[PDB]
Design an enzyme around this catalytic site. Structure first.
Site, PDB file in Angstrom:
ATOM      1  N   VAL A   1       0.882  -1.159   0.000  1.00  0.00           N
ATOM      2  CA  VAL A   1       0.000   0.000   0.000  1.00  0.00           C
ATOM      3  C   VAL A   1       0.917   1.205   0.000  1.00  0.00           C
TER       4      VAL A   1
ATOM      5  N   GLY B   1       8.100   9.478  -5.996  1.00  0.00           N
ATOM      6  CA  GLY B   1       8.644   9.978  -4.757  1.00  0.00           C
ATOM      7  C   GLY B   1       7.626   9.706  -3.665  1.00  0.00           C
ATOM      8  N   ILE B   2       8.066   9.129  -2.550  1.00  0.00           N
ATOM      9  CA  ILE B   2       7.145   8.851  -1.464  1.00  0.00           C
ATOM     10  C   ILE B   2       7.558   9.528  -0.162  1.00  0.00           C
TER      11      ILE B   2
ATOM     12  N   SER C   1      17.940  -3.308  15.037  1.00  0.00           N
ATOM     13  CA  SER C   1      18.242  -2.791  16.358  1.00  0.00           C
ATOM     14  C   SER C   1      17.130  -2.734  17.390  1.00  0.00           C
TER      15      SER C   1
ATOM     16  N   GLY D   1       5.334   0.281   4.159  1.00  0.00           N
ATOM     17  CA  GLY D   1       6.273   1.039   3.353  1.00  0.00           C
ATOM     18  C   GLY D   1       7.570   1.320   4.085  1.00  0.00           C
TER      19      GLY D   1
ATOM     20  N   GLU E   1      -9.051  30.595 -28.413  1.00  0.00           N
ATOM     21  CA  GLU E   1     -10.147  30.385 -29.348  1.00  0.00           C
ATOM     22  C   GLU E   1     -11.459  30.524 -28.596  1.00  0.00           C
TER      23      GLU E   1
ATOM     24  N   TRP F   1      -7.090  28.156 -36.869  1.00  0.00           N
ATOM     25  CA  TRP F   1      -7.987  28.563 -37.957  1.00  0.00           C
ATOM     26  C   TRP F   1      -7.331  29.074 -39.241  1.00  0.00           C
TER      27      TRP F   1
ATOM     28  N   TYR G   1     -19.052  30.243 -35.206  1.00  0.00           N
ATOM     29  CA  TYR G   1     -19.300  30.136 -33.757  1.00  0.00           C
ATOM     30  C   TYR G   1     -19.543  31.399 -32.958  1.00  0.00           C
TER      31      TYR G   1
ATOM     32  N   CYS H   1     -19.329  22.680 -36.083  1.00  0.00           N
ATOM     33  CA  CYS H   1     -19.060  21.292 -35.727  1.00  0.00           C
ATOM     34  C   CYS H   1     -19.614  20.960 -34.346  1.00  0.00           C
TER      35      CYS H   1
ATOM     36  N   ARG I   1     -21.886  17.365 -34.356  1.00  0.00           N
ATOM     37  CA  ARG I   1     -22.198  16.610 -35.567  1.00  0.00           C
ATOM     38  C   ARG I   1     -21.028  15.858 -36.191  1.00  0.00           C
TER      39      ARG I   1
ATOM     40  N   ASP J   1     -13.416  15.082 -35.250  1.00  0.00           N
ATOM     41  CA  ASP J   1     -12.108  14.573 -35.636  1.00  0.00           C
ATOM     42  C   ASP J   1     -11.488  14.135 -34.305  1.00  0.00           C
TER      43      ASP J   1
HETATM   44  N1  LIG Z   1       3.994   7.682   0.727  1.00  0.00           N
HETATM   45  C1  LIG Z   1       4.060   6.474   1.250  1.00  0.00           C
HETATM   46  O1  LIG Z   1       3.337   5.584   0.885  1.00  0.00           O
HETATM   47  C2  LIG Z   1       5.055   6.191   2.316  1.00  0.00           C
HETATM   48  C3  LIG Z   1       6.177   6.975   2.465  1.00  0.00           C
HETATM   49  N2  LIG Z   1       7.057   6.717   3.422  1.00  0.00           N
HETATM   50  C4  LIG Z   1       8.234   7.561   3.546  1.00  0.00           C
HETATM   51  O2  LIG Z   1       9.386   6.786   3.250  1.00  0.00           O
HETATM   52  C5  LIG Z   1      10.459   7.153   4.099  1.00  0.00           C
HETATM   53  C6  LIG Z   1      10.964   5.946   4.869  1.00  0.00           C
HETATM   54  O3  LIG Z   1      11.400   4.937   3.975  1.00  0.00           O
HETATM   55  P1  LIG Z   1      12.897   4.421   4.060  1.00  0.00           P
HETATM   56  O4  LIG Z   1      13.742   5.641   4.103  1.00  0.00           O
HETATM   57  O5  LIG Z   1      13.146   3.399   3.006  1.00  0.00           O
HETATM   58  O6  LIG Z   1      12.966   3.725   5.490  1.00  0.00           O
HETATM   59  P2  LIG Z   1      12.154   2.407   5.877  1.00  0.00           P
HETATM   60  O7  LIG Z   1      10.811   2.805   6.380  1.00  0.00           O
HETATM   61  O8  LIG Z   1      12.309   1.382   4.811  1.00  0.00           O
HETATM   62  O9  LIG Z   1      12.947   1.852   7.132  1.00  0.00           O
HETATM   63  C7  LIG Z   1      14.314   1.486   7.030  1.00  0.00           C
HETATM   64  C8  LIG Z   1      14.725   0.762   8.296  1.00  0.00           C
HETATM   65  O10 LIG Z   1      14.086  -0.504   8.304  1.00  0.00           O
HETATM   66  C9  LIG Z   1      14.951  -1.506   8.821  1.00  0.00           C
HETATM   67  N3  LIG Z   1      15.357  -2.454   7.768  1.00  0.00           N
HETATM   68  C10 LIG Z   1      15.312  -2.272   6.453  1.00  0.00           C
HETATM   69  N4  LIG Z   1      15.799  -3.364   5.842  1.00  0.00           N
HETATM   70  C11 LIG Z   1      16.152  -4.231   6.798  1.00  0.00           C
HETATM   71  C12 LIG Z   1      16.700  -5.491   6.778  1.00  0.00           C
HETATM   72  N5  LIG Z   1      16.985  -6.093   5.609  1.00  0.00           N
HETATM   73  N6  LIG Z   1      16.944  -6.114   7.935  1.00  0.00           N
HETATM   74  C13 LIG Z   1      16.663  -5.522   9.091  1.00  0.00           C
HETATM   75  N7  LIG Z   1      16.139  -4.305   9.139  1.00  0.00           N
HETATM   76  C14 LIG Z   1      15.874  -3.646   8.004  1.00  0.00           C
HETATM   77  C15 LIG Z   1      16.224  -0.795   9.219  1.00  0.00           C
HETATM   78  O11 LIG Z   1      16.134  -0.431  10.591  1.00  0.00           O
HETATM   79  P3  LIG Z   1      17.371  -0.518  11.591  1.00  0.00           P
HETATM   80  O12 LIG Z   1      18.173   0.688  11.240  1.00  0.00           O
HETATM   81  O13 LIG Z   1      16.713  -0.480  12.923  1.00  0.00           O
HETATM   82  O14 LIG Z   1      18.038  -1.814  11.276  1.00  0.00           O
HETATM   83  C16 LIG Z   1      16.203   0.441   8.360  1.00  0.00           C
HETATM   84  O15 LIG Z   1      16.967   1.455   9.001  1.00  0.00           O
HETATM   85  C17 LIG Z   1       9.924   8.227   5.017  1.00  0.00           C
HETATM   86  O16 LIG Z   1      10.184   9.485   4.403  1.00  0.00           O
HETATM   87  C18 LIG Z   1       8.435   8.048   4.962  1.00  0.00           C
HETATM   88  O17 LIG Z   1       7.826   9.319   5.160  1.00  0.00           O
HETATM   89  C19 LIG Z   1       6.888   5.700   4.251  1.00  0.00           C
HETATM   90  C20 LIG Z   1       5.785   4.881   4.143  1.00  0.00           C
HETATM   91  C21 LIG Z   1       4.853   5.128   3.161  1.00  0.00           C
HETATM   92  C1  LIG Z   2     -11.792  21.683 -32.365  1.00  0.00           C
HETATM   93  C2  LIG Z   2     -11.049  22.657 -32.547  1.00  0.00           C
HETATM   94  C3  LIG Z   2     -10.202  23.789 -32.755  1.00  0.00           C
HETATM   95  N1  LIG Z   2      -9.798  23.636 -34.067  1.00  0.00           N
HETATM   96  C4  LIG Z   2     -10.669  24.181 -35.023  1.00  0.00           C
HETATM   97  C5  LIG Z   2     -10.653  23.284 -36.164  1.00  0.00           C
HETATM   98  C6  LIG Z   2     -10.774  23.811 -37.370  1.00  0.00           C
HETATM   99  C7  LIG Z   2     -10.738  22.954 -38.398  1.00  0.00           C
HETATM  100  C8  LIG Z   2     -10.588  21.632 -38.169  1.00  0.00           C
HETATM  101  N2  LIG Z   2     -10.519  20.811 -39.168  1.00  0.00           N
HETATM  102  C9  LIG Z   2     -10.393  19.559 -39.000  1.00  0.00           C
HETATM  103  N3  LIG Z   2     -10.345  18.850 -40.068  1.00  0.00           N
HETATM  104  N4  LIG Z   2     -10.295  19.012 -37.844  1.00  0.00           N
HETATM  105  C10 LIG Z   2     -10.348  19.768 -36.796  1.00  0.00           C
HETATM  106  O1  LIG Z   2     -10.242  19.243 -35.599  1.00  0.00           O
HETATM  107  C11 LIG Z   2     -10.498  21.100 -36.958  1.00  0.00           C
HETATM  108  C12 LIG Z   2     -10.521  21.961 -35.941  1.00  0.00           C
HETATM  109  C13 LIG Z   2      -8.585  23.070 -34.315  1.00  0.00           C
HETATM  110  C14 LIG Z   2      -7.998  23.203 -35.476  1.00  0.00           C
HETATM  111  C15 LIG Z   2      -6.771  22.693 -35.625  1.00  0.00           C
HETATM  112  C16 LIG Z   2      -6.148  22.010 -34.649  1.00  0.00           C
HETATM  113  C17 LIG Z   2      -4.814  21.535 -34.801  1.00  0.00           C
HETATM  114  O2  LIG Z   2      -4.286  21.592 -35.817  1.00  0.00           O
HETATM  115  N5  LIG Z   2      -4.193  21.298 -33.736  1.00  0.00           N
HETATM  116  C18 LIG Z   2      -2.816  20.950 -33.802  1.00  0.00           C
HETATM  117  C19 LIG Z   2      -2.099  22.245 -33.587  1.00  0.00           C
HETATM  118  C20 LIG Z   2      -0.858  22.254 -32.764  1.00  0.00           C
HETATM  119  C21 LIG Z   2      -0.904  23.308 -31.729  1.00  0.00           C
HETATM  120  O3  LIG Z   2      -1.930  23.510 -31.140  1.00  0.00           O
HETATM  121  O4  LIG Z   2       0.076  23.951 -31.473  1.00  0.00           O
HETATM  122  C22 LIG Z   2      -2.441  20.123 -32.677  1.00  0.00           C
HETATM  123  O5  LIG Z   2      -1.348  19.667 -32.645  1.00  0.00           O
HETATM  124  O6  LIG Z   2      -3.222  19.860 -31.818  1.00  0.00           O
HETATM  125  C23 LIG Z   2      -6.701  21.908 -33.471  1.00  0.00           C
HETATM  126  C24 LIG Z   2      -7.924  22.430 -33.341  1.00  0.00           C
HETATM  127  C1  LIG Z   3       3.275   4.421   7.302  1.00  0.00           C
HETATM  128  N1  LIG Z   3       2.623   5.666   6.965  1.00  0.00           N
HETATM  129  C2  LIG Z   3       3.116   6.492   5.892  1.00  0.00           C
HETATM  130  C3  LIG Z   3       2.071   6.471   4.815  1.00  0.00           C
HETATM  131  C4  LIG Z   3       1.335   7.601   4.528  1.00  0.00           C
HETATM  132  N2  LIG Z   3       0.407   7.581   3.575  1.00  0.00           N
HETATM  133  C5  LIG Z   3       0.187   6.451   2.891  1.00  0.00           C
HETATM  134  N3  LIG Z   3      -0.747   6.412   1.933  1.00  0.00           N
HETATM  135  C6  LIG Z   3      -0.959   5.279   1.251  1.00  0.00           C
HETATM  136  N4  LIG Z   3      -1.898   5.235   0.290  1.00  0.00           N
HETATM  137  N5  LIG Z   3      -0.252   4.180   1.519  1.00  0.00           N
HETATM  138  C7  LIG Z   3       0.683   4.180   2.474  1.00  0.00           C
HETATM  139  N6  LIG Z   3       1.396   3.071   2.747  1.00  0.00           N
HETATM  140  C8  LIG Z   3       0.921   5.328   3.176  1.00  0.00           C
HETATM  141  N7  LIG Z   3       1.852   5.341   4.138  1.00  0.00           N
HETATM  142  C9  LIG Z   3       1.494   6.057   7.663  1.00  0.00           C
HETATM  143  C10 LIG Z   3       0.657   5.089   8.165  1.00  0.00           C
HETATM  144  C11 LIG Z   3      -0.477   5.459   8.855  1.00  0.00           C
HETATM  145  C12 LIG Z   3      -0.770   6.790   9.041  1.00  0.00           C
HETATM  146  C13 LIG Z   3      -2.011   7.128   9.785  1.00  0.00           C
HETATM  147  O1  LIG Z   3      -2.119   8.252  10.469  1.00  0.00           O
HETATM  148  N8  LIG Z   3      -2.942   6.297   9.718  1.00  0.00           N
HETATM  149  C14 LIG Z   3      -4.214   6.449  10.379  1.00  0.00           C
HETATM  150  C15 LIG Z   3      -4.896   7.621   9.704  1.00  0.00           C
HETATM  151  C16 LIG Z   3      -6.402   7.529   9.856  1.00  0.00           C
HETATM  152  C17 LIG Z   3      -7.043   8.799   9.369  1.00  0.00           C
HETATM  153  O2  LIG Z   3      -6.397   9.859   9.422  1.00  0.00           O
HETATM  154  O3  LIG Z   3      -8.206   8.746   8.934  1.00  0.00           O
HETATM  155  C18 LIG Z   3      -5.027   5.218  10.188  1.00  0.00           C
HETATM  156  O4  LIG Z   3      -6.216   5.239  10.528  1.00  0.00           O
HETATM  157  O5  LIG Z   3      -4.485   4.217   9.698  1.00  0.00           O
HETATM  158  C19 LIG Z   3       0.064   7.763   8.537  1.00  0.00           C
HETATM  159  C20 LIG Z   3       1.203   7.392   7.844  1.00  0.00           C
END
Ligand SMILES: NC(=O)C1=CN([C@@H]2O[C@H](COP(=O)(O)OP(=O)(O)OC[C@H]3O[C@@H](n4cnc5c(N)ncnc54)[C@H](OP(=O)(O)O)[C@@H]3O)[C@@H](O)[C@H]2O)C=CC1
Ligand SMILES: C#CCN(Cc1ccc2[nH]c(N)nc(=O)c2c1)c1ccc(C(=O)N[C@@H](CCC(=O)O)C(=O)O)cc1
Ligand SMILES: CN(Cc1cnc2nc(N)nc(N)c2n1)c1ccc(C(=O)N[C@@H](CCC(=O)O)C(=O)O)cc1
Ligand SMILES: NC(=O)C1=CN([C@@H]2O[C@H](COP(=O)(O)OP(=O)(O)OC[C@H]3O[C@@H](n4cnc5c(N)ncnc54)[C@H](OP(=O)(O)O)[C@@H]3O)[C@@H](O)[C@H]2O)C=CC1
Ligand SMILES: C#CCN(Cc1ccc2[nH]c(N)nc(=O)c2c1)c1ccc(C(=O)N[C@@H](CCC(=O)O)C(=O)O)cc1
Ligand SMILES: CN(Cc1cnc2nc(N)nc(N)c2n1)c1ccc(C(=O)N[C@@H](CCC(=O)O)C(=O)O)cc1
Ligand SMILES: O=c1ccn([C@H]2C[C@H](O)[C@@H](COP(=O)(O)O)O2)c(=O)[nH]1
Ligand SMILES: O=c1ccn([C@H]2C[C@H](O)[C@@H](COP(=O)(O)O)O2)c(=O)[nH]1
Lengths: 516, 516
Positions: free
Chosen positions: A7, A16-17, A76, A112, A289, A311, A337, A397, A418, A421
């Site tokens: 998840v 990026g997470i 740890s 995660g 346009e 045009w 138009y 059109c 009607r 394209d």
């Molecule tokens: N957007 C999202 O869905 C989520 C984002 N995140 C973000 O990600 C970041 C954290 O991720 P990340 O930096 O990868 O850290 P992690 O959450 O993956 O945790 C890393 C730690 O996990 C333990 N670990 C990892 N691998 C092993 C292994 N092979 N054996 C034993 N322990 C292990 C280690 O702990 P130890 O040092 O104790 O050995 C390590 O320091 C945070 O910024 C968080 O905000 C996190 C969850 C979700």
């Molecule tokens: C619907 C509508 C507006 N119109 C008006 C317009 C006028 C004559 C048309 N004639 C035909 N044959 N098809 C169209 O879709 C059409 C559209 C458009 C006209 C041209 C393009 C077109 O050439 N677009 C290219 C231009 C690149 C750019 O935008 O920089 C494109 O890459 O998308 C898009 C829209």
């Molecule tokens: C591990 N982690 C980082 C995090 C943040 N967003 C995410 N989002 C998604 N989709 N998936 C993840 N794994 C995820 N992880 C977490 C996990 C739980 C909560 C948290 O506050 N959870 C409450 C939040 C509930 C709520 O706010 O409604 C829960 O009910 O599980 C925040 C960050």
């Protein structure tokens, strides 16, 4: 056997997470999702286990998570007895003995730390992945989600949601071993077989055979069969349907197309903006346009002057000559138009004339009816004027739209188009009328609703085949967000600078020639 | 133990299957179906067995059926070892030893005679029923298919097919045993639970939550989950959709409705005519209002004279008054459609005036383009003239339509309908524009194509709830056919008598009051 699922919430482009021991972002709905998902179980006498690296354990304050058991991996940390809802292990594989025993543990989640993710994946320990994609790039990240191993396939992608202007998704990947994307198929042998046989007997005669489900080689992210929620599938799937059923037909431009009649597309605008992500879309030109339309302006130079050339083609002397309008100045498009929006049934002379006062102002009336009588069923805007068609560079059109104020207080929009394209015009039309609906909503005091587009002739020009196949190979990303910087007093006042496009991370633009 | 299914072709209303030792009809596609179905098997080294009563054996000439084994039930027939492809048994039960043994026998089919079906069903020997419904009534039957036991439920209903002007389907029935009607849900626990959880978190913010699947109590023939192919479901499910999601909202009428925005319906017009069978529909009045439009007539008397009263409510002196149009003779409806079809943008005075020459003749133009330029992407007909709304007894509901000539030489039609009364107007519009398309198609030398209806405000008036729920309780029957008795010169030449409505066996009429 006991399911083990990852998840995570990772950035859409870099995965990026984390940054400096914390999340790069703050999106509560995502935590609610995390909580609901990891808490979800069948047996009330069992609990789910949440495995996580030690740094993540630190990151959440070393405090237990309700109804669940936290399993911390640390070389740890001491294995103490203080809390029975938190337990420590020296390596991932060992902790995985949630499987070979504790019958009190229903499901397992890898919750995660990059280090933990990477091992669980490397050692083939996970069955499923719940990936929350966050549209946040260009910010610092020091922790990443590993690249999903090829043994995983996406099976679900929800629509885009929005929090504090940040767009995000929800995807599910499943590891599929051993061994049609059609949802109403593969459901029951007898139904499928019967329909298949009925299809052999009748031919084109069975309507279903005229609407064949797309072969998978033209089906975007085909492994997602029952979960294509992301509303960008609405456009990709239409592409697939015309690639699969399109009749090959000639037309006025000399560049043939593949054509089907009578499709639809619906997009949500409450949580996000329908700007295709599978290809970089030119949104500035769209906006220009659109504003050009709103001002009832039909002078093509005003567009060119702002380096927007959509045009040009249909404005050229050559072209205008071909359709019998050689009398026009360059780029005088006629009553198209904009004109029909501001001055319906007005007598067009040229682009240089002043038409204030002439014709019916549909746009103005639209905004008045929308404000004064919202639940009225007549909020219509049209551009089809039988008397003016021959004077238009090109017949309308996007031909008619109607507007529906929710009890929620949102503005929804329907548009019949009607001719569409699919490669070049549709992406434009979708965004355009998404923007118009938001502009109308702001000046009328409403929130954006839903957008639905109904299409007559939906086609792909034959020189866009490889480009659209290219596009179809790209899995969609979360839709961006579009916000207005100021609240304008007049819809005619909007300016590009007023538009804020937040979190648009598209795939490369794809070149495609427009057919004149 | 292996599968036992019935295969039968029975008339729609009385389930007649025979007369004087033969079938009441001759529909070869159904024989082809019978053959595909009873020949259908997996193991290439086994065969299927067809059980039939002796009389049926006589009726097919006592000649074996290729690739199959025929099991005849007769007390008298000699049990000879002569033909290894035909076998005789003294009773139906003894025959079922095809199960217990002949591992050469993959599947079993009870292939009929009323006497054999009635026994097979009474003694619980059948698991499935393949049932071709034929729309022939008012002809002699002396043999019938028993009434399907309640332990059986319908899981599939094909679209209506046509042979020799005879409407027919096929549908499958499955026997029920212990154990969501939604297609996409129930496919994977992971996906349904994720979508569910996401819904819980976001509520109305998740578009899906704004389009809930209809609860079964209001879904027509709910057991058919993946096989709702009968295009009468397009209407019925839209009914179900608004009953489930419809927003309670007031309107000009005074009678509040339930409302959703942006919906669509699809109908085939190649094999059948989309005239609703779940309620008897007044086709004549429809035709009369249609031919009225075609002619460009705005005179409401002309319909009353022909005893068609659909335009009375909105044409009375009292109503024309409430909307400020009293300077008008009663039933002078103003330039609505018809005027808009024949004289778009023409200046309107009274109905008695002569308009030949004024306005744009869209209909005429339509027909001339459908003929000379089929592939043209502009076959449009619009009735929405902002310059004239003020003087129309009522603004146009069916607002714009587009027409599309396939390579197949058929005419398909798309209609946008800004406002749609589902209980009263929708059944009419589906039929109306179906007919108009057939008329246009005959006149232009084409065959009927497909019909798609795109709706803006889709609603149900609160006083139609009981009637509609009643309708929703009736399972659909094959659509009827609709043919023209002659080829008219001009489209204005059609007359009621020119229309032959074949095989319509609707449910009883359902009375519904129209909100003025
Ligand atoms: N957007 C999202 O869905 C989520 C984002 N995140 C973000 O990600 C970041 C954290 O991720 P990340 O930096 O990868 O850290 P992690 O959450 O993956 O945790 C890393 C730690 O996990 C333990 N670990 C990892 N691998 C092993 C292994 N092979 N054996 C034993 N322990 C292990 C280690 O702990 P130890 O040092 O104790 O050995 C390590 O320091 C945070 O910024 C968080 O905000 C996190 C969850 C979700
Ligand atoms: C619907 C509508 C507006 N119109 C008006 C317009 C006028 C004559 C048309 N004639 C035909 N044959 N098809 C169209 O879709 C059409 C559209 C458009 C006209 C041209 C393009 C077109 O050439 N677009 C290219 C231009 C690149 C750019 O935008 O920089 C494109 O890459 O998308 C898009 C829209
Ligand atoms: C591990 N982690 C980082 C995090 C943040 N967003 C995410 N989002 C998604 N989709 N998936 C993840 N794994 C995820 N992880 C977490 C996990 C739980 C909560 C948290 O506050 N959870 C409450 C939040 C509930 C709520 O706010 O409604 C829960 O009910 O599980 C925040 C960050
Ligand atoms: N529409 C459709 O799908 C089908 C229609 N049909 C029609 O149905 C009609 C025939 O049906 P039906 O009139 O009922 O006759 P059946 O075809 O059901 O055959 C009746 C005969 O089967 C034998 N039989 C029946 N019951 C028993 C029993 N309990 N024990 C021993 N033998 C038994 C008897 O033969 P014996 O006299 O030798 O004892 C009896 O005369 C025909 O008109 C045919 O056209 C037939 C098949 C399909
Ligand atoms: C669309 C359209 C035409 N129109 C135009 C029309 C005009 C105003 C409307 N107003 C409202 N609120 N709903 C409508 O459907 C509606 C329809 C119709 C009007 C009435 C009937 C109708 O009441 N039919 C009755 C009985 C008539 C009959 O039996 O033939 C019925 O019970 O079905 C049908 C169509
Ligand atoms: C028993 N019987 C009467 C009959 C007629 N129509 C039916 N139709 C259906 N749907 N189900 C039946 N049981 C059925 N039975 C039969 C059976 C076989 C043939 C017959 O000629 N069958 C060939 C027909 C082949 C063909 O016409 O292509 C076959 O291949 O099965 C005709 C009548
Ligand atoms: O807003 C627009 C303007 C034009 N087109 C496309 C549709 C057709 O490909 C072409 C119009 O050509 P005709 O249908 O008039 O032949 O331009 C659009 O898709 N959207
Ligand atoms: O072809 C038609 C003509 C009228 N109506 C119904 C829809 C609404 O119930 C009413 C129109 O009301 P307003 O859109 O004018 O509010 O008539 C239809 O459904 N179909």
């Amino acid at each position: 056997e006991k399911n083990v699922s990852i998840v995570v919430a990772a950035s859409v482009l870099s995965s990026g997470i984390g940054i400096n021991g914390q999340l790069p972002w703050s999106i509560s709905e995502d935590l609610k999702f995390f909580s609901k998902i990891t808490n979800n179980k069948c047996d009330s006498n069992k609990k789910n286990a949440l495995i996580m690296g030690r740094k993540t354990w630190d990151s959440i304050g070393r405090r237990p998570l309700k109804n669940r058991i936290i399993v911390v991996i640390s070389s740890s940390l001491p294995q103490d007895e203080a809390d029975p809802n938190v337990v420590v292990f020296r390596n991932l594989e060992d902790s995985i003995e949630n499987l070979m025993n504790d019958d009190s543990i229903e499901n397992i989640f890898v919750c995660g730390g990059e280090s933990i993710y990477r091992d669980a994946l490397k050692d083939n320990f996970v069955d499923r992945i719940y990936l929350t994609r966050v549209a946040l790039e260009d910010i610092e990240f020091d922790t990443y989600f590993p690249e999903i191993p090829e043994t995983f396939l996406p099976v679900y992608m929800s629509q885009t949601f929005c929090t504090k202007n940040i767009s995000y998704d929800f995807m599910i990947f499943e590891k599929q071993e051993k061994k049609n994307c059609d949802p109403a198929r593969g459901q029951l042998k007898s139904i499928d077989d019967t329909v298949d046989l009925l299809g052999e007997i009748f031919g084109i005669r069975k309507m279903g055979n005229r609407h064949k489900f797309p072969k998978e080689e033209i089906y975007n992210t085909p492994s997602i069969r029952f979960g294509r929620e992301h509303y960008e599938f609405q456009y990709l799937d239409l592409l697939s349907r015309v690639l699969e059923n399109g009749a090959y037909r000639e037309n006025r431009t000399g560049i043939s197309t593949y054509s089907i009649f009578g499709q639809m597309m619906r997009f949500d605008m409450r949580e996000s903006f329908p700007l295709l992500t599978t290809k970089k879309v030119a949104i500035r030109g769209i906006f220009e346009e659109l504003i050009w339309f709103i001002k009832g302006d039909t002078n093509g130079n005003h567009l060119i002057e702002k380096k927007v050339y959509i045009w040009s083609g249909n404005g050229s002397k050559e072209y205008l000559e071909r359709i019998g309008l050689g009398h026009r100045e360059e780029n005088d498009l006629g009553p198209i138009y904009g004109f029909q929006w501001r001055h319906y049934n007005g007598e067009y002379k040229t682009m240089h004339d002043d038409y204030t006062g002439v014709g019916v102002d549909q746009l103005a009336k639209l905004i008045e009816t929308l404000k004064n009588n919202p639940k009225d069923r007549r909020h219509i805007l049209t551009a089809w004027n039988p008397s003016a068609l021959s004077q238009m560079a090109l017949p309308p059109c996007h031909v008619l739209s109607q507007y529906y104020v929710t009890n929620d207080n949102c503005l929804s929009c329907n548009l019949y188009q009607r001719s569409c394209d699919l490669g070049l015009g549709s992406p434009f039309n979708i965004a355009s009328y998404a923007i118009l609906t938001m502009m109308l909503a702001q000046v009328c005091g409403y929130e954006p609703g839903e957008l639905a587009i109904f299409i007559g002739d939906a086609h792909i020009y034959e020189n866009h085949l490889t480009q659209l196949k290219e596009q179809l190979s790209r899995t969609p990303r979360p839709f961006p967000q579009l916000k207005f910087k100021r609240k304008v007093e007049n819809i005619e006042d909007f300016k590009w600078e007023d538009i804020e496009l937040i979190g648009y991370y598209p795939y490369p633009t794809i070149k495609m020639d427009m057919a004149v």
